[PDB]
Symmetry: C3
Subunit: 259 residues, 3 copies
């Protein structure tokens, strides 16, 4: 009978875990303020659509980190036999319970933010509807199956099967990034900036599945505090710095992506 209150207090007392969360709550917030003033000059509906979806990324993030820091989107799950973290304890204060600290809150919200990054890139590269639809739907599938992976406590194999299904959807997104939109950006006349964000996106995302396999959800070698900082670190680049570069361009070349 673990309460939200114990999880909140649990996030505290553990400076490694606590800092990684609250730090982003503020970084996301400040990021929004900056982006709003940076795009005040835009007047082109198509140029402003690109900015709105870019700005929504940090918006989903503060909510995501707040949900986590609060204990709303965190849970104690008893891993299945054969699992490395199986047999673990946590102790939410004075009473220690069986299981591990599951921060499914991240996986859930990714289904919201990532489609937004993609919407941004896709529009920058003058993508057509079919390609946007394809990237976004498989991207969402990737996130939701990952969340199902983390919540599966009945069998060790099922958990990894989920992981596999998520990787397969990932390749579809990677494929449109590297191959499809890369070509479309040329006709749109944004291959320059597109190449930049594209290179950024792929590298950064590629790291999320890795941290997962290492952290308690997977092999369980990395501590929850480090895995959290890893993601927290990845989000900082995969989202905020990514948002700045894109917006910085949009304001300088509103005529390019106009129409």
């Amino acid at each position: 009978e673990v309460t939200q209150r114990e999880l909140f207090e649990f996030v505290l007392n553990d400076p490694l875990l606590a800092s990684s969360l609250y730090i982003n709550i503020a970084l996301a917030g400040l990021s929004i303020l900056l982006f709003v003033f940076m795009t005040r000059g835009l007047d082109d509906p198509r140029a402003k659509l690109i900015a709105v979806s870019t700005i929504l990324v940090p918006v989903v993030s503060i909510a995501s980190y707040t949900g986590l820091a609060s204990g709303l989107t965190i849970s104690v799950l008893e891993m299945p036999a054969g699992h490395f973290a199986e047999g673990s304890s946590v102790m939410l204060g004075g009473e220690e319970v069986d299981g591990v600290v599951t921060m499914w809150g991240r996986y859930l919200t990714w289904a919201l933010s990532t489609p937004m990054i993609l919407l941004a890139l896709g529009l920058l590269a003058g993508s057509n509807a079919t390609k946007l639809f394809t990237a976004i739907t498989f991207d969402i599938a990737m996130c939701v199956t990952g969340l199902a992976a983390a919540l599966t406590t009945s069998s060790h194999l099922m958990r990894w099967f989920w992981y596999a299904i998520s990787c397969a959807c990932f390749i579809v997104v990677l494929y449109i990034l590297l191959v499809e939109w890369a070509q479309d950006a040329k006709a749109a006349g944004t291959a320059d900036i597109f190449s930049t964000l594209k290179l950024l996106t792929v590298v950064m995302w590629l790291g999320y599945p890795i941290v997962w396999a290492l952290g308690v959800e997977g092999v369980a070698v990395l501590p929850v505090g480090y895995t959290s900082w890893a993601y927290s670190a990845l989000d900082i680049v995969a989202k905020y710095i990514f948002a700045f570069l894109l917006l910085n361009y949009l304001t300088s070349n509103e005529g390019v992506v106009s129409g």
Copy 2:
């Protein structure tokens, strides 16, 4: 371990509460039928897009009220330390239980119905995609964070922090409603009706965050039965008569909204 049947029984047994839910199950159902009958004459696809988006509002409403009356989307939660309602008890049948009655089913479904209200209004006003995308996304972020606020029981401050994020998202919606679409409507030849609905929408929508703050979830000065009728009252205007007025216009001005 409160049961669903217990919350269902708790709704009945309480005249104020019972009537606020069951009356709207009937009004929304009657609204749907009336609205379908009123628009059976439309021919223009665009006019028809507006009519369906509008009819979906009471469709989501009847589902939402059934989810609450049946107890499926209600829960009894204990408020964090210092909350004005911490220490309250509810009493189900012959047993007394700690906590407050949280009708989170409303916050959740608003995420589906309010986007539809906005869809119909935006289109009626001749909005472009970028503004629709903006009103709608932040409208959803508003509803979702409001839900998070009602579901957060770990900290009193976290709750009001969720509420603040939600208010920020709300101003965005109000902005495009009061400024953006007010102008587009003139250009689309629908300023007369928009003005009536924009005024109705803004005044009514303002009432929800007030009701939330005054009820058990906030400073708890109003009983659960009172707060429920306040919302039901708002929905009757913000949803049903708002849809009647819009469809009555629509059915007499099919040509103007055609384009």
Copy 3:
């Protein structure tokens, strides 16, 4: 009290229920490969929109069945007084638990795969955006209220009230398929194929509320293992062979639907 593992092991140790779930994880996966391979030569963006839409059906499906076999989207629920399955025991794990085995994960994912079946068909029929929006939102409403019906345990009358609402949403979808799109396909030059898939779709989809009614969720004349196999048999036709047939035509008539 009822753990996921107990549910995951209840499925296993019950040949019927297990096979009804694992066989479709396999069929769904084999369908994706086959469909991907079949659609390699497509080039027209609109033709490829219909293809990706169709392929997502079996993608949603493999994940769905994994969630049911893993026990992640299964629950034991107690039926309301008056329910023909009230007072039932599932005999979960070692103890005998009250209630019935509810596979709500099916209803949850339908809200994601059925809209894709509809996008493909609407597109194939050359439907405008208004009819597509109408069919899809009411389809989702139908799925969601069906899920709520199964998840409601407070009142027997409330369960059938959800069921009725959901049915009302269903007629909207059926009307768009049988009346609207049937005419639109004649203009899009896909009259025969759409009429064929329209009939396959209408016949199989009607099977669902019938199964729901006859199974544990309904009047309970069909045990859980049998209700599960009936759903799985319906999925094989309404999803996999349905997609197979649609893509078979598509890959031979890309020009007809090439449009924009």
